[PDB]
Swiss-Prot record:
Changing residue 63 to W: Found in a patient with primordial dwarfism; uncertain significance. Disulfide bonds join 19-61, 31-74, 60-65. It comes from the Eukaryota. Residues 55-75 are annotated as: A. Residues 14-42 are annotated as: B. It is linked to Insulin-like growth factor I deficiency: An autosomal recessive disorder characterized by growth retardation, sensorineural deafness and intellectual disability. It is found in: Secreted. This is Insulin-like growth factor 1. It comes from Homo sapiens.
Amino acid sequence: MFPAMPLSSLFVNGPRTLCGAELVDALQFVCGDRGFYFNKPTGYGSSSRRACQTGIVDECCFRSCDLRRLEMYCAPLKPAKSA
């Protein structure tokens, strides 16, 4: 999927170069299967609960982060136009 894009087949099952929105549904899985996001610089990049850097997708795939983490960031999904 996603042409222009660089790649999206090996870990990105919906996202771009992520490890799949899966990890996303994880954070929202405990907070609400509804589905959550990740590093969303809503307010302001350098102005949010010390996180993001913990790429729940790149940091989860890289830094063994079970569901305990996803639960930690239990960040409030940022709906706008997911799909």
